[PDB]
Amino acid sequence: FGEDTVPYERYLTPGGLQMRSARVGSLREDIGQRVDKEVTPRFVELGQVSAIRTEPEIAYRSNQGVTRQRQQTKVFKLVSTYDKVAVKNAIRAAYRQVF
Amino acid sequence: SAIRTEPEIAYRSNQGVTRQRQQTKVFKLVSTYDKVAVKNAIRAAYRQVF
Amino acid sequence: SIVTKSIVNADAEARYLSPGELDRIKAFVTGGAARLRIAETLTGSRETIVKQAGDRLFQKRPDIVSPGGNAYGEEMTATCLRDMDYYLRLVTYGVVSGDVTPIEEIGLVGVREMYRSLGTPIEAVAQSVREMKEVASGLMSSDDAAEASAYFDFVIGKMS
Amino acid sequence: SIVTKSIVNADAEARYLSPGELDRIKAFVTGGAARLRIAETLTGSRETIVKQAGDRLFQKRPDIVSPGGNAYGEEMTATCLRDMDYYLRLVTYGVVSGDVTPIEEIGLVGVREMYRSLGTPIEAVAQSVREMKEVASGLMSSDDAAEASAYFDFVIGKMS
Amino acid sequence: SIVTKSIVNADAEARYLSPGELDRIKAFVTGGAARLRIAETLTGSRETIVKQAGDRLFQKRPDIVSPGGNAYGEEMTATCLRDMDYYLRLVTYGVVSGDVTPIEEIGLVGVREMYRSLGTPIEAVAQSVREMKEVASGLMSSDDAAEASAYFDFVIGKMS
Amino acid sequence: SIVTKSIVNADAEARYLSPGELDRIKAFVTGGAARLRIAETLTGSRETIVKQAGDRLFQKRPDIVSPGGNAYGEEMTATCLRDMDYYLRLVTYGVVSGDVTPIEEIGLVGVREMYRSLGTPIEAVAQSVREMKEVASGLMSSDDAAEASAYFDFVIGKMS
Amino acid sequence: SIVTKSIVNADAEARYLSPGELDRIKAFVTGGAARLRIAETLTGSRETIVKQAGDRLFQKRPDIVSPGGNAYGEEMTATCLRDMDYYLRLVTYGVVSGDVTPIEEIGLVGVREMYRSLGTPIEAVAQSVREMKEVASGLMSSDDAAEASAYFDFVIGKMS
Amino acid sequence: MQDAITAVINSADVQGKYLDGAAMDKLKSYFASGELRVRAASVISANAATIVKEAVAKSLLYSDVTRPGGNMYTTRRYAACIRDLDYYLRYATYAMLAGDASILDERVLNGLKETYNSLGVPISSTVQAIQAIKEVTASLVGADAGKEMGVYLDYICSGLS
Amino acid sequence: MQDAITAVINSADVQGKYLDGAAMDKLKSYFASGELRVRAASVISANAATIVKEAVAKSLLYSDVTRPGGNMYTTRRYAACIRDLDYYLRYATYAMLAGDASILDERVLNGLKETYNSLGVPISSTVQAIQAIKEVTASLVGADAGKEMGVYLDYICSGLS
Amino acid sequence: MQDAITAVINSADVQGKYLDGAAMDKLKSYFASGELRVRAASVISANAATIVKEAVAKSLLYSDVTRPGGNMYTTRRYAACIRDLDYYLRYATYAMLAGDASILDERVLNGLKETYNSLGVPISSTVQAIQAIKEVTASLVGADAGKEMGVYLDYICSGLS
Ligand SMILES: *[C@@H](C)[C@H]1/C(=C/c2[nH]c(/C=C3N=C(/C=C4\NC(=O)C(CC)=C4C)C(C)=C\3CCC(=O)O)c(CCC(=O)O)c2C)NC(=O)[C@@H]1C
Ligand SMILES: *[C@@H](C)[C@H]1/C(=C/c2[nH]c(/C=C3N=C(/C=C4\NC(=O)C(CC)=C4C)C(C)=C\3CCC(=O)O)c(CCC(=O)O)c2C)NC(=O)[C@@H]1C
Ligand SMILES: *[C@H](C)[C@H]1/C(=C/c2[nH]c(/C=C3N=C(/C=C4\NC(=O)C(CC)=C4C)C(C)=C\3CCC(=O)O)c(CCC(=O)O)c2C)NC(=O)[C@@H]1C
Ligand SMILES: *[C@H](C)[C@H]1/C(=C/c2[nH]c(/C=C3N=C(/C=C4\NC(=O)C(CC)=C4C)C(C)=C\3CCC(=O)O)c(CCC(=O)O)c2C)NC(=O)[C@@H]1C
Ligand SMILES: *[C@H](C)[C@H]1/C(=C/c2[nH]c(/C=C3N=C(/C=C4\NC(=O)C(CC)=C4C)C(C)=C\3CCC(=O)O)c(CCC(=O)O)c2C)NC(=O)[C@@H]1C
């Protein structure tokens, strides 16, 4: 300190430094501990989709291959003729398919 | 890579814009003194227009 | 979903939905809360489920991760865990939807052909799904355990 | 080729080839033997010519092969030598055809844009072509040296 | 961080933060969106910036990477690029903080001693940071480039 | 100028200027103050800009000032610095005009053929323009540097 | 729209939008609050503005309402009211878009042909638009009146 | 074509010198006048057809030119004259906006005089019509803008003389 | 073409009504996004050549297309690819600035499919190049502003599919 | 140190009156000049070291003072001279920003003359160097800001001499 400088704390004893920087707060993550570099799982990265997949691409890819109508349908098999309601339903479906 | 069979050779020998872009003539009446050149330009004009 | 299945049936018959189908839709909507809870539980425990499932599967079938196996290398093991993550996501989808329809339509049609082309043991994949079911049942409530185990057993039977 | 050039001119004028054009094609066919000899000479020393040309080019322009250059690594240097091989092959095509038409069509239109996109110094590429021309002139006869140097200088001028 | 610096100053004079200091903190908090945008830009284009700056620096100072230089060799050049990446990360930290304190604490105190010990030319490292600054300034508008230029120039001045 | 461009477009359309065009004209005349400020800064610092950019260019490209280079010799170097001053004056004209038409008309049409006749590396000319750009940007404010950046980059791109 | 107009000009020149055009777009988007307020005011006073303008038109040019004139009956006067409503709406569209392209595309190109087919005096239509402009200027602030009056004057001049 | 800015730039460039104080002052003057120029151009574009109509009626209509035997007789010649006046007004407005008469020099002047001489068009009648347009536009745009507009119109008249 | 503003205006004009609160709200949303759009557009214009450079480097270079006999062989054809990628980037920037992907339909996708099919241009390879452009531009302008650029480049890719 | 605002406030407070119209106008004038002052300060801050470099090159180098036997001969004394010129530049910038020379009076010239007389520093040479700083800064920042910058520098020179 010259003729114009107020003194200030320049050195700390190790005990005082430990009291200041060893509490649960103010303790650095890497001081006395093995810091393992966190990384996302490799399978998560593998299954992760590239790019952002904007809404146009999402809507387009939701209907991508053969249309879902191949599975979203019914097949009318007249298993038994006792069910008159089922027979009528099958007959109406046959009309719809034929005409 | 590969063996480059004749089908692909024929296909790729003419791949992009047709070679007619460069295999054509442009007629300019540079001077009016060559009557043969003028007649060639006129015939070319007829061919282009009609 | 039951909604889509009922709509498809009604449209095939060219008619409006019957009171029974509407009551079924009502019950499905009512159970949607519990189904959402189960799906959220699985999604939260996602990385855990794949991790212990893969560890137990490799313990039961060490040859798949052994040299010469389909999943020997670290990349191959990551690819197994990727497939397991795929199937867990599909199971969560099915739990939300109340039906096995999303699972079957996404990752159960031609699964045998795909794994035969890849040279993967389909029974090993079934054991992987079984381990995933065990982990989820362990870290999930008893009734929700059965509710998710229905879909897990569906996927396992499809594998077998 | 003078053949296709005269054919295009005749078709554009809607006429048969004139006596002068026929005589020109006759002289072209007469010189075809020497042109084939020169082309075979160039083709025989393909690997050698690119070797000395690339070595002398790197000696003249060390920066392109030094670190940070476009041709630093072994793969980058191999890519340079591949480009030089391409240009020598085009030069052989032109020597055969008796005209620079194939050289211009396959490797001179948009060359500036391509090398600007790739970051390659076009002047350095021209220097490489100059080195190849010098090597070919050294290992060829004096008259054949001039005949091939015509096409080499055409390529150099187009690059410059 | 400007908040940390203001708090430290207020503690040193043993007084609550002045209204001017509070206004400055509020201004920084409001303007943090631009800082986050700049940090995101640098993080996204880090590899491109590092690669281009490295190539430019190597061309400007070939000796450091030629044999006998500090950075000669593939692994030495990898370490040099890793150093440049470290300093880019430090610049992003400084941009996010709004103060050069993180940069000085992490990669500017004892830098001269570290590089003199390693034998690496400190002015060469400063030139590398300058190349990185130029690339980053090109990769963003004048305002964001002007903001990041403060931290870039601070690092360059400390190195010089 | 934008006024000239708007007049030309309106004449080509055979119509009076539209309200948007008049608004753009008003914006241009309002920004003329900043344009004149930037132009005055460049004019005042032209000599230092030219000298520093020339020194940096010579260091980057010693060949041009090396024996056998175009700029070799004191008179050739003086002529090259005169060319750099010419292009700085053109940049000032573009700055005041708010467009690149003065530069393009004066010193960008046929410049490639002109320097090819003179035996001048157009890449070296572009590098000189670049160096003048960094010198001006350093000695000019951030926004003004951004404004001059468009003209400097236009000249550089025309060179390359 | 101003954005569409600048985009079309840039596309015609085969170039990206210039910094001046980007500045114009930025200024327009920033000042959009005033344009939206003006459109709100015009849409609000749509009824009274059109009524007063049409009435003043009728005592200004009674021939159109006279026997033999185009709009003699109350039905034809209603058709004039609809036309003036159309043109007011188009002016509001132009005000919000910041450019005269929507107005020109909707009701300016071929307006002469339309009114010649209908027998309408285009001069009287321009006078009606002028009266709407006067009443709008009365109903708006001076600067806002000028901003709308730009588009009113454009429509009037194109009609005349 | 040239405007005030390009004219100053060319005047400096021909001497090969940077923009001096005088060039900066002229640019400042043009920039200051730009607002009034834009307003006048907007008004003239708004009322362009009426300006030509009123000028024609005041200077040409019901005179010997419009009477048979005058140049303006017949619908075709009348339309040609009207188009000439309209283009005169539009190019004068362009020149007013640019602050320079160069657009008039190489888009309204070169060939116009000898074309009128070849076709027999009355140069004096055209000058009178342009004067009528000048006074009409002065009335529309006021004294300040009308001064510049009439300056450029008189430039056109002198060139066509 | 069309933008956000023109889209709102046309939406109002199809039913002939004036602009209600919803239209003004949509216009306000576009004006809010305008700063981001201008920022991204200026950045992409400044770095246009670079973006195509790394897209080609990481998507097409050292491959069958570039090898002799490949469609990207024959340096004229390579320059044609560079120009086409620049066209895609410029028109995607146009769409991003406008807020509506109609300029792409009426100025890029109009006949492009037929062009490539007749020319033997690998559509999937071009799509991969455009995806690489999307990644590069997203990394260059951030995630948020890069989202719009990705949306419009994805529109181009889907139209080209 | 009092800036223009502080000078206005002090003038008002001496009479104990609220801010009158004159103080209003002076504050408005300082606000008007604030943009120019801030731009000049930013430019000088960016180019502070270089300006000192050309100033010393133009004024002092290759002189008897820089040669052995001169005050600037030693490396330490040359560094001190550079530091002194840096002080002059920075505090002239401070005076420019504040619109007053109070800071220059209180800090720069408190004991500068006495310390120079004690240390034997050449007052004439340092005045010439500060003058050269004035011309270089005027050239860099333009005539408008350079005038006031030279005013402050001449104030420093007059106080030192
Ligand atoms: C360990 C758990 C088991 C195993 C798995 C395994 N899978 C692969 C590779 C692939 N797995 C898939 C699967 C799917 N794709 C889908 O879209 C769906 C859901 C709709 C599924 C289930 C695919 C497509 C691949 C290959 C392509 C890709 O990975 O992107 C591997 C690696 C195979 C190889 O040699 O590459 C492995 C190891 N293998 C076993 O042996 C275990 C039973
Ligand atoms: C050293 C000789 C110079 C140099 C060359 C260089 N070129 C590349 C990469 C490519 N070169 C080409 C060139 C052609 N393709 C064609 O079809 C034709 C017709 C003959 C030419 C001339 C191409 C297409 C590429 C890239 C694609 C590919 O290689 O498959 C490189 C590598 C650059 C990189 O980043 O990969 C280099 C080094 N570069 C220099 O600096 C020297 C002047
Ligand atoms: C696989 C590597 C690529 C791919 C293909 C793909 N195709 C389908 C579906 C069909 N493929 C055909 C094609 C043919 N049928 C024939 O008889 C012939 C003669 C050889 C051909 C070429 C047909 C008809 C279909 C639809 C009918 C059916 O699938 O049964 C799919 C699945 C479509 C779906 O929705 O299931 C796929 C995936 N897709 C890629 O991405 C690869 C590049
Ligand atoms: C490059 C990575 C891919 C590729 C492209 C390619 N295109 C051409 C030629 C043309 N490209 C176009 C395209 C357009 N013109 C338009 O106006 C629009 C709007 C933006 C588009 C998209 C056209 C019209 C042509 C023909 C004219 C011309 O060649 O310039 C070529 C070269 C064709 C030729 O003969 O030179 C190439 C190589 N090809 C690939 O293999 C890549 C996947
Ligand atoms: C009207 C005020 C006077 C008038 C007009 C008139 N003009 C013509 C014929 C031509 N006038 C022009 C004009 C121009 N050429 C230019 O480059 C410019 C710059 C815009 C102008 C104004 C031209 C080109 C022609 C000939 C071609 C054409 O007319 O289309 C005529 C025709 C005369 C005749 O006998 O055919 C007339 C009548 N006539 C008057 O009496 C007025 C004083």
Tab-separated table of C-alpha atoms and ligand atoms in Angstrom, chain H residues 56 59-60 65-66 70-74 76-88 90-91 104 107-113 115-116 118-130 133 160, ligand 5:
chain	number	residue	atom	x	y	z
H	56	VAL	CA	-54.172	21.052	-72.865
H	59	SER	CA	-53.111	26.097	-74.018
H	60	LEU	CA	-54.283	24.056	-77.014
H	65	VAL	CA	-53.911	23.541	-83.654
H	66	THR	CA	-57.027	21.608	-82.672
H	70	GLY	CA	-53.587	22.144	-87.357
H	71	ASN	CA	-51.233	19.411	-86.237
H	72	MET	CA	-53.570	18.232	-83.469
H	73	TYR	CA	-56.496	17.507	-85.795
H	74	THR	CA	-57.936	13.964	-85.894
H	76	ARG	CA	-54.955	9.897	-83.782
H	77	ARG	CA	-52.914	13.104	-83.779
H	78	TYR	CA	-54.732	14.332	-80.671
H	79	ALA	CA	-53.876	11.101	-78.850
H	80	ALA	CA	-50.254	11.370	-79.978
H	81	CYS	CA	-50.064	14.929	-78.643
H	82	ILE	CA	-51.686	13.910	-75.353
H	83	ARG	CA	-49.236	11.027	-74.961
H	84	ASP	CA	-46.345	13.396	-75.664
H	85	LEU	CA	-47.556	15.789	-72.975
H	86	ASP	CA	-48.115	12.963	-70.488
H	87	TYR	CA	-44.606	11.611	-71.038
H	88	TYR	CA	-43.255	15.158	-70.724
H	90	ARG	CA	-43.830	12.118	-66.088
H	91	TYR	CA	-40.203	12.584	-67.128
H	104	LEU	CA	-34.417	14.475	-69.662
H	107	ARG	CA	-34.665	10.097	-72.435
H	108	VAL	CA	-36.702	13.078	-73.702
H	109	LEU	CA	-34.281	15.273	-75.632
H	110	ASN	CA	-31.992	13.332	-77.981
H	111	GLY	CA	-33.885	12.938	-81.247
H	112	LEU	CA	-37.051	14.681	-80.053
H	113	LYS	CA	-36.280	17.966	-81.806
H	115	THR	CA	-38.372	14.018	-84.863
H	116	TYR	CA	-40.742	16.958	-84.414
H	118	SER	CA	-39.514	15.617	-89.515
H	119	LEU	CA	-43.169	15.156	-88.554
H	120	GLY	CA	-43.987	18.869	-88.739
H	121	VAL	CA	-45.073	19.054	-85.094
H	122	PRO	CA	-45.372	22.679	-83.896
H	123	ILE	CA	-42.451	23.301	-81.553
H	124	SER	CA	-43.948	26.621	-80.446
H	125	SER	CA	-47.288	24.974	-79.671
H	126	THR	CA	-45.519	22.236	-77.713
H	127	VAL	CA	-43.577	24.873	-75.772
H	128	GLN	CA	-46.806	26.696	-74.928
H	129	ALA	CA	-48.394	23.431	-73.789
H	130	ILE	CA	-45.374	22.717	-71.585
H	133	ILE	CA	-48.332	22.275	-67.660
H	160	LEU	CA	-36.972	21.327	-77.655
K	5	LIG	C1	-48.559	17.784	-78.365
K	5	LIG	C2	-48.192	18.605	-77.151
K	5	LIG	C3	-48.000	18.355	-79.678
K	5	LIG	C4	-48.154	17.365	-80.800
K	5	LIG	C5	-47.792	16.048	-80.749
K	5	LIG	C6	-47.429	15.119	-81.741
K	5	LIG	N1	-46.327	14.302	-81.676
K	5	LIG	C7	-46.274	13.496	-82.786
K	5	LIG	C8	-45.327	12.482	-83.010
K	5	LIG	C9	-44.299	12.086	-82.186
K	5	LIG	N2	-43.970	12.697	-80.992
K	5	LIG	C10	-43.004	11.932	-80.425
K	5	LIG	C11	-42.483	12.201	-79.129
K	5	LIG	C12	-41.410	11.867	-78.336
K	5	LIG	N3	-40.352	11.044	-78.641
K	5	LIG	C13	-39.503	10.924	-77.570
K	5	LIG	O1	-38.481	10.243	-77.544
K	5	LIG	C14	-40.060	11.748	-76.490
K	5	LIG	C15	-39.679	11.522	-75.054
K	5	LIG	C16	-40.831	11.018	-74.215
K	5	LIG	C17	-41.212	12.314	-76.971
K	5	LIG	C18	-42.137	13.249	-76.250
K	5	LIG	C19	-42.673	10.797	-81.278
K	5	LIG	C20	-41.658	9.735	-80.981
K	5	LIG	C21	-43.485	10.896	-82.380
K	5	LIG	C22	-43.550	9.951	-83.547
K	5	LIG	C23	-43.959	8.546	-83.145
K	5	LIG	C24	-45.385	8.441	-82.689
K	5	LIG	O2	-46.068	9.541	-82.852
K	5	LIG	O3	-45.857	7.428	-82.219
K	5	LIG	C25	-47.383	13.824	-83.599
K	5	LIG	C26	-47.734	13.219	-84.930
K	5	LIG	C27	-47.679	14.222	-86.065
K	5	LIG	C28	-48.062	13.637	-87.392
K	5	LIG	O4	-48.276	14.310	-88.378
K	5	LIG	O5	-48.144	12.332	-87.377
K	5	LIG	C29	-48.103	14.824	-82.945
K	5	LIG	C30	-49.380	15.444	-83.429
K	5	LIG	N4	-48.736	18.000	-81.867
K	5	LIG	C31	-49.071	19.308	-81.619
K	5	LIG	O6	-49.556	20.081	-82.439
K	5	LIG	C32	-48.728	19.621	-80.178
K	5	LIG	C33	-47.949	20.923	-80.020
